[PDB]
Amino acid sequence: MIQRTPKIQVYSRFPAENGKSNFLNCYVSGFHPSDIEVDLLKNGERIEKVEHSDLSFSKDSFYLLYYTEFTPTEKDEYACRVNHVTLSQPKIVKWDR
Ligand SMILES: Cc1ccc2c(c1)sc(-c1ccc(N(C)C)cc1)[n+]2C
Numbered sequence: 001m002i003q004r005t006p007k008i009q010v011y012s013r014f015p016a017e018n019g020k021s022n023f024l025n026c027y028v029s030g031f032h033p034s035d036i037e038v039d040l041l042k043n044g045e046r047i048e049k050v051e052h053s054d055l056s057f058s059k060d061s062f063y064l065l066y067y068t069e070f071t072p073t074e075k076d077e078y079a080c081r082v083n084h085v086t087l088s089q090p091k092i093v094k095w096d097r
């Protein structure tokens with residue numbers, strides 16, 4: 001049996017500018033088994049208009065890229081939440097502007 005913790009990067013396509021359109025990305029990789037939950041949150045609310053890659057597998061583990069087009073503002077908070085068996089509790093990774 002193999003258990004591997006998701007590695008998570010949360011990043012915008014470009015440096016943020018309030019009122020300027022951009023992409024927000026949550027890349028989750030290196031995990032096993034494939035059981036996982038991934039959501040993007042804006043101000044504590046699941047983001048509805050999201051795209052992602054088809055769940056896939058690399059001998060060196062599982063990976064998903066999950067993203068959305070967005071326009072940030074001064075006060076909006078974004079995060080990617082990941083749950084996986086290797087985590088003691090679901091992990092919230094904030095977008096650091
Ligand atoms: C599958 C896989 C493995 C590693 C991996 C990714 C995907 S995506 C990533 C990444 C690296 C640098 C940055 N910025 C400088 C914004 C954003 C994301 N890494 C390091």
Ligand SMILES: Cc1ccc2c(c1)sc(-c1ccc(N(C)C)cc1)[n+]2C
Nearest residue numbers: 042043044045073074075076077078
């Ligand atoms: C985790 C979490 C939960 C709730 C939550 C946030 C983060 S951030 C937020 C907020 C409230 C007001 C504004 N403006 C007036 C621009 C922008 C963001 N709420 C309401």
Ligand SMILES: [Hg+2]
Nearest residue numbers: 051052053055
């Ligand atoms: Hg899905």
